[PDB]
Write an enzyme that holds these catalytic residues in place. Sequence first.
Site, mmCIF file in Angstrom:
data_model
loop_
_atom_site.group_PDB
_atom_site.id
_atom_site.type_symbol
_atom_site.label_atom_id
_atom_site.label_comp_id
_atom_site.label_asym_id
_atom_site.label_seq_id
_atom_site.Cartn_x
_atom_site.Cartn_y
_atom_site.Cartn_z
ATOM 1 N N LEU C 252 0.938 -1.586 9.496
ATOM 2 C CA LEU C 252 1.331 -0.586 10.477
ATOM 3 C C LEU C 252 2.835 -0.477 10.633
ATOM 4 O O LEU C 252 3.323 0.552 11.111
ATOM 5 C CB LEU C 252 0.720 -0.909 11.829
ATOM 6 C CG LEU C 252 -0.790 -1.074 11.910
ATOM 7 C CD1 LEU C 252 -1.182 -1.276 13.338
ATOM 8 C CD2 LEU C 252 -1.507 0.107 11.352
ATOM 9 N N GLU C 254 4.795 -0.060 8.294
ATOM 10 C CA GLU C 254 5.268 0.744 7.178
ATOM 11 C C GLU C 254 5.070 2.232 7.435
ATOM 12 O O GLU C 254 5.882 3.053 6.993
ATOM 13 C CB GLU C 254 4.546 0.311 5.914
ATOM 14 C CG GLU C 254 4.619 -1.182 5.686
ATOM 15 C CD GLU C 254 4.206 -1.610 4.290
ATOM 16 O OE1 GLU C 254 3.953 -0.732 3.439
ATOM 17 O OE2 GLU C 254 4.133 -2.833 4.043
#
Lengths: 344, 427, 441
Positions: C252, C254
Amino acid sequence: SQVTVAVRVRPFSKREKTEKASQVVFTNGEEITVEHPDMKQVYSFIYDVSFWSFDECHPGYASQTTVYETLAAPLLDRAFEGYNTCLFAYGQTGSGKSYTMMGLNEEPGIIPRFCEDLFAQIAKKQTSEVSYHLEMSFFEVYNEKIHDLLVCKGENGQRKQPLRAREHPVSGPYVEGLSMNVVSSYSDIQSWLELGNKQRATAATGMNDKSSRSHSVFTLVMTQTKTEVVEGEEHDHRITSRINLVDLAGSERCSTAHSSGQRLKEGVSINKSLLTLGKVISALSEQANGKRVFIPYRESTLTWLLKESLGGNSKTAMIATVSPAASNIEETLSTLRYATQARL
Amino acid sequence: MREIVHIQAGQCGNQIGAKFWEVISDEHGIDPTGSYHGDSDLQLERINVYYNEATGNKYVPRAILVDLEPGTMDSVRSGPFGQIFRPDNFVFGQSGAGNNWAKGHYTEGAELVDSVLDVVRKESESCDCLQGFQLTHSLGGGTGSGMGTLLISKIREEYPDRIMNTFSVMPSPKVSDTVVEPYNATLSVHQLVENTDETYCIDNEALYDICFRTLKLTTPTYGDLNHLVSATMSGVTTCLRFPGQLNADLRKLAVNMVPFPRLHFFMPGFAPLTSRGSQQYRALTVPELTQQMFDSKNMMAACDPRHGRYLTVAAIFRGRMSMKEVDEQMLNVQNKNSSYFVEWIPNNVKTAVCDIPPRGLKMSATFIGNSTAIQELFKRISEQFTAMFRRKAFLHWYTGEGMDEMEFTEAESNMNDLVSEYQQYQD
Amino acid sequence: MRECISIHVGQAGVQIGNACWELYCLEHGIQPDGQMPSDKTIGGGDDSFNTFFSETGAGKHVPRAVFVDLEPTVIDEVRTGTYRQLFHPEQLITGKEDAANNYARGHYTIGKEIIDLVLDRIRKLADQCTGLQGFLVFHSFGGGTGSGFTSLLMERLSVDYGKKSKLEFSIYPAPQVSTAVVEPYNSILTTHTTLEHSDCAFMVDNEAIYDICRRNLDIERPTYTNLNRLISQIVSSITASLRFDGALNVDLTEFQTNLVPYPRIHFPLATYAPVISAEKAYHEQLSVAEITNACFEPANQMVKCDPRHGKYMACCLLYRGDVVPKDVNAAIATIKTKRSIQFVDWCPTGFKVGINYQPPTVVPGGDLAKVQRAVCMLSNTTAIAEAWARLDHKFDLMYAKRAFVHWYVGEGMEEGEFSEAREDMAALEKDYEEVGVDSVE
Ligand SMILES: CC(=O)O[C@H]1C(=O)[C@@]2(C)[C@H]([C@H](OC(=O)c3ccccc3)[C@]3(O)C[C@H](OC(=O)[C@H](O)[C@@H](NC(=O)c4ccccc4)c4ccccc4)C(C)=C1C3(C)C)[C@]1(OC(C)=O)CO[C@@H]1C[C@@H]2O
Ligand SMILES: Nc1nc2c(ncn2[C@@H]2O[C@H](COP(=O)(O)OP(=O)(O)OP(=O)(O)O)[C@@H](O)[C@H]2O)c(=O)[nH]1
Ligand SMILES: Nc1nc2c(ncn2[C@@H]2O[C@H](COP(=O)(O)OP(=O)(O)O)[C@@H](O)[C@H]2O)c(=O)[nH]1
Ligand SMILES: Nc1ncnc2c1ncn2[C@@H]1O[C@H](COP(=O)(O)OP(=O)(O)O)[C@@H](O)[C@H]1O
Ligand SMILES: [Mg+2]
């Protein structure tokens, strides 16, 4: 039926002078910019009248004489014409509203100038044939309930009688049970207004503790007996004129100010009332252009009591006091957007 | 849990409520002995909205009855579903109103309203969280107008935060079962619009026409008429009792359907409705119901909506259905018939769906509408009123009971201002 | 070690959750009572993965979520349904009264008296977590709860927790379709406060999924169960790298790092391209090329917004099943060859890729078919400004007559909090315009 909206920016106080608080609002003639310190952007506001009272040597400075001579004296002459007038006043605590309408014992506001110029023009216009007689009244609105302020309460849970409003067909709306007292000099007005504002309801959420939680109308009915029929010379047609001067309360957001109970109601009603007033003012600025609209006076008490002072061939004036600090940047924005919608 | 208190006044209110309860009991599985003999378990999850519990699995409704002649309360008692009521709530008196708004508001109504509020406080303080009140009264008459409006004035002071509806039976243009209809209706509108949140104007001409043209009945008595008002009342508070895909309540509708506070007089409607013979030739689907709802020969307002514009509309559906069908159909209505909808409100419609239909149908629907056309329902009275009031026809029966002429001009001007308000959004 | 707390607000939130958790229970073998036969069959594995489901000593698995509606009618179907033995009984059934489709009532008046319990339960859940990364909220614009209580909760959470991701899967209002007059006001007041707090705010539109059902799945009369399952598939494609083993994992941290250039333009759109039925599940190869071409295809998006009227700033593609990066390289090159798909002049890469081995699961009583591979794409566009402007026009039509305001100021609001939000949302519409301009030398 033309309504004028104005603004007066107060100059820095001694505290915010010492703390070097930041200036956020500036003037370009008749435009007023508000600049968030440098954050992203700036908003620009335009009004029919603008009083830049930030420092003494700026061009377009606005002394108290200028405020009176621009906002009030038209109300005076239009009253002597025989029509009615309503002056408004808006501003949160720490904006320069008491300094504006009343003033200080050496810096007069609007009210003393109004009354003094009135009695002067009367006593110089009073003749062997013509005459004049004035009568005052002073009441307040608290949670959409009316209360009179000239009465000297005893001791009770509350000596505040919730008077009822009625609609006489010809004269229009009125208040049943309103104390109306004569006047011939301004000191007699001060003697009542001090008592009244001492009886005005005030409360403290977490901010400045003596903040008004109610609306307050000060009304003067003035009579002209100019008319003497020479056929028998006993009195005939006669002119009457109503002059209302109303001090309102603040918008007051109820979330940042974690309020409960009576501090919420007191705020909710004020929000509603102001909104209704806004619509009325807007509609009248839309009425002068020549359109067909409906002025909903009945959605609020203050409007229903003043249906005849605003509508018709009458005059209205609104002034909005705002602070130029950066701490009070949301309140000033609220005030200016309110008055802008009152303009359009 | 939410909780409604049902007040009901006058002959009209008694005879409407006695059928309303007769239906809610069937929907929830209750019998006239107060006992439960149902089949489904969702009938009891939310029985606290209208009923209260008792000892032997009994269920007593929160009904208050506020007449001023016992002639009608005895008919409810001496009736099918009369025993379930609480006898301590059958408020009544003597010295009837004489079909006079004065007696029901000042003289023979102030002498009893305290005994009514004594029951209202009992049945309100005994609640976890009240949502609001209800009332069923007939304008034009006496008691139902006067005492009803007085109770509204006295409940809006104590309980301002809560909701107060009124299923009011407005007068009719053509027929008139009472000669002092205008003077009472005007003074009731003067005291309703200031002190209500959503009222449902009903007219008996519309219900006769519905019973004659659609249901194709030859002998419609008032039992067959109130049988429809009950259905509407039930449909308003369905998503407050049963589950749904998109729930709702009274306050939601009052928020969506009241742009401005003085404009909360609604035309109601219920669908499906067919003659006993013609139920074999109709497809039970959403569009058929929408066609029946937005038609003018089903609204109970005795008022043609096509002579005005829909400021706001609400549709409460009941049954296992789709959420594409409802949205599609309502958008189609907003688009095709755009002249009957305002433009400064883009979506003039909303939806609610419950998953539990009525006892004998696979689908049902209920319709509420705020329409400017309602001015016709008052512009008429202001003709009947002033014509009678221009020379003071029947007025000495009103002054003599402690009134004054100014109180009439007040209501006249207010009703006329409301007309002018609804005309603002007409052209 | 890799945890994500889910929060569900409103009817929309709870129903999306009842879809999502059915899906998650099916993927991991968890039964509705919370037990597992597999782990007692062989004795091993963490199929009931600790990202979503907790565990206690009795071989039971409880979800890491909490519900709240300010209305009891919905949660009382969960408490009285097939999934009653799974959820901790602390679900907020604060069913005194609802918000009445009013932001003011789900922010101050009725939004208090609940929120402290929510914070307590979220602390209780986080303290059971080691490496928490995320707060996935599911709410709905238009409602009072999902507009107000969500804003207040995120205000509190950006103080209590801080450097933690807080995403949002919302139901954005439709341009034509809607179920309320007060959708706009609540939306414009929500976006004003849920822009400085949130990190990535996904958005869908029921009109788009309705169009998808009657054109891909061949359903002419769908219901919300047929939509929330697709949303659950989206969330599963999003939250799979934390659960199942794959080649190119994507956490998450990224998504918020490769789709938010600037901290104000974090409003992307979603697509899940294979929405075909078991009949059309045959007659079609279902390769990476077809799917990735479908993601960039209008009439397969989940927001009614034609991207050809705008430009792409970034797009993450999360694939599942039998996939090889060769095919993704080919498909990305194909999409970059085309000309209808304009990328900005400051993002030549414009592509994050994620690959996983676990294919999607089939819900019985469903509409989708079994497939050997599936795809989700999340895409940031300059085109979603159109919808913002559309909503703002409705705002500016109603707020000029000052309609429906007294219901708000009668619940703790002034008239300035409106104009503070239309002027805050009239700048983001300018930001999405500025980012669209090609640079100059
Ligand atoms: C198989 C079938 O469909 O027969 C219907 C029937 O013929 C129709 C005409 C029923 C019938 O309604 C009437 O006969 C009627 C008569 C005069 C005035 C109004 C109605 C029915 O009685 C109504 C009854 O349905 C109900 O009872 C509803 O649950 C209704 N119940 C009651 O009102 C009720 C009254 C007294 C005691 C107990 C229950 C209801 C409606 C709304 C909300 C709650 C309950 C049914 C199946 C029918 C008959 C029996 C013919 C209809 O009823 C309603 C309000 O939907 C009238 O048109 C509808 C459509 C039905 O087709
Ligand atoms: N996709 C999807 N949308 C839904 C669902 N349920 C409701 N909605 C949408 O949510 C919008 C409004 O939210 P609500 O259903 O009122 O729920 P809420 O946010 O809690 O509002 P309140 O209950 O009044 O507090 C509706 O207009 C629907 O469009 C659902 O199950 N699925
Ligand atoms: N719908 C309906 N209307 C009724 C009924 N009984 C009386 N009315 C109407 O009520 C009006 C008279 O109201 P009334 O019964 O005298 O109310 P009261 O003064 O409170 O007793 C008339 O216009 C009738 O049409 C009934 O059972 N049903
Ligand atoms: N035009 C002005 N010139 C100088 N000082 C001003 C002016 N207007 C306001 N002030 C200052 O601002 C202060 C206003 O305080 P206060 O009367 O409490 O405002 P309000 O009545 O709006 O609460 C006064 O102390 C006054 O000295
Ligand atoms: Mg809800």
